[PDB]
């Protein structure tokens, strides 16, 4: 059954980028929206929009540069089967800093860089290059 | 044979104890021959084995290596044919055996005429004879 919704979101993006889809819609959640904000601020997606009330849906507008998807690789790190937590000094660097790592800290979801500045470790949600 | 290994060790020690003691296994007979400067000498050694070395042994006369030789001359034929299908095995040789000069051993003569036996097969014939000669033809 459906057990990892975050990995599904990442798959939808990846599969959408590979299929050259303008936007990818999915069932919405607070954590999904948080990650969507981090992706948008880091310039991996164009925009996101949550619509509906009883059953909200999150639509993400994907961005393609020179006919190539901006998100070259998006992979889930921490998963239900194996959760990954890192201290502030152990925070991962994706693509030697050229990529981002979405991390859930005690002060909310943020990039690895931001978390390292705040001196906060947390759960490594995904790597986005 | 448990004491045989001990006997080896015993003979080694005995040789160290007495220079005149000489232990040597005759290869042909396959029997170990003990050499001494006297009967009493050897007797004492054997008694020592029985006690000191705790190796039970019984002395005997060394076996003699004999040989054989044809006392008569006769021309003979050796034919081997085994063909029942596909590659077979044919071979026929007419060899004359004659008593050689005592001590001259083997004096094979290739008197093949008309190249009936090809040159390549000739050495094999001789070699085969030699091996068979090494094996007993009488006893």
């Amino acid at each position: 059954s459906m057990q990892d919704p975050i990995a599904d979101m990442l798959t939808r993006i990846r599969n959408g980028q590979a299929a050259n889809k303008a936007a990818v819609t999915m069932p919405s959640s607070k954590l999904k929206v948080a990650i969507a904000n981090v992706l948008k601020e880091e310039g991996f997606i164009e925009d996101f929009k949550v619509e509906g009330d009883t059953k909200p849906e999150l639509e993400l507008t994907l961005k393609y540069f020179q006919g190539k998807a901006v998100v070259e690789s998006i992979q889930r790190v921490s998963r239900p089967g194996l959760r990954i937590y890192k201290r502030k000094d152990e925070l991962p660097k994706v693509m030697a800093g050229l990529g981002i790592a979405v991390v859930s800290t005690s002060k909310g979801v943020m990039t690895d860089r931001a978390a390292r500045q705040a001196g906060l470790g947390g759960e490594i949600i995904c790597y986005v290059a | 044979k448990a004491d045989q290994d001990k006997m080896t060790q015993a003979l080694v020690k005995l040789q160290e104890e007495d220079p005149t003691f000489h232990a040597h296994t005759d290869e042909e007979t396959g029997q170990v021959i003990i050499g001494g400067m006297g009967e009493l000498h050897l007797d004492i050694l054997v008694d020592r084995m029985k006690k000191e070395f705790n190796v039970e042994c019984n002395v005997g006369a060394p076996m003699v290596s004999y040989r054989e030789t044809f006392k008569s001359s006769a021309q003979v034929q050796g034919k081997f044919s085994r063909q029942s299908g596909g590659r077979g095995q044919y071979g026929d040789v007419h060899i004359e055996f004659t008593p050689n000069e005592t001590g001259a051993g083997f004096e094979f003569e290739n008197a093949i005429v008309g190249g009936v036996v090809p040159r390549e097969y000739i050495p094999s014939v001789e070699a085969g004879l030699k091996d068979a000669m090494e094996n007993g033809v009488l006893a």
Partner: protein
């Protein structure tokens, strides 16, 4: 394999056996020659390779190869054997150490003398 399966049953290594069991983790072992003889190599080689059955101090009886040209080894000769199998000889997994114990060095050897226990000419 999944992590959960690995927690239940961890990754398993291998025993890895020795090619020279009679040595019993020793550089060399002393032994007495029980039979010195010759044997034919397996195809595609042809020769009369010199070998000797040896009863080691540890109590194992093994076959050892007598390297070099010419040897003075007879039955009841104390020799030192080392590790080293012979490809074309089936069952010979040890080599006699030339120039040690009752084993003599190869004569008329001017190259690789240390490997045949020959003193500097």
């Amino acid at each position: 394999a999944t992590v959960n399966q690995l927690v239940r049953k961890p990754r398993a290594r291998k025993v890895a056996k020795s090619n020279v069991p009679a040595l019993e983790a020793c550089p060399q072992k002393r032994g007495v020659c029980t039979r010195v003889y010759t044997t034919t190599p397996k195809k595609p080689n042809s020769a009369l390779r010199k070998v000797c059955r040896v009863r080691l101090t540890n109590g194992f009886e093994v076959t050892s190869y007598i390297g070099g040209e010419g040897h003075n080894l007879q039955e009841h000769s104390v020799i030192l054997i080392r590790g080293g199998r012979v490809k074309d000889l089936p069952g010979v997994r040890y080599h006699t150490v030339r120039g040690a114990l009752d084993c003599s060095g190869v004569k008329d050897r001017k190259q690789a003398r240390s490997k045949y226990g020959v003193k500097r000419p």
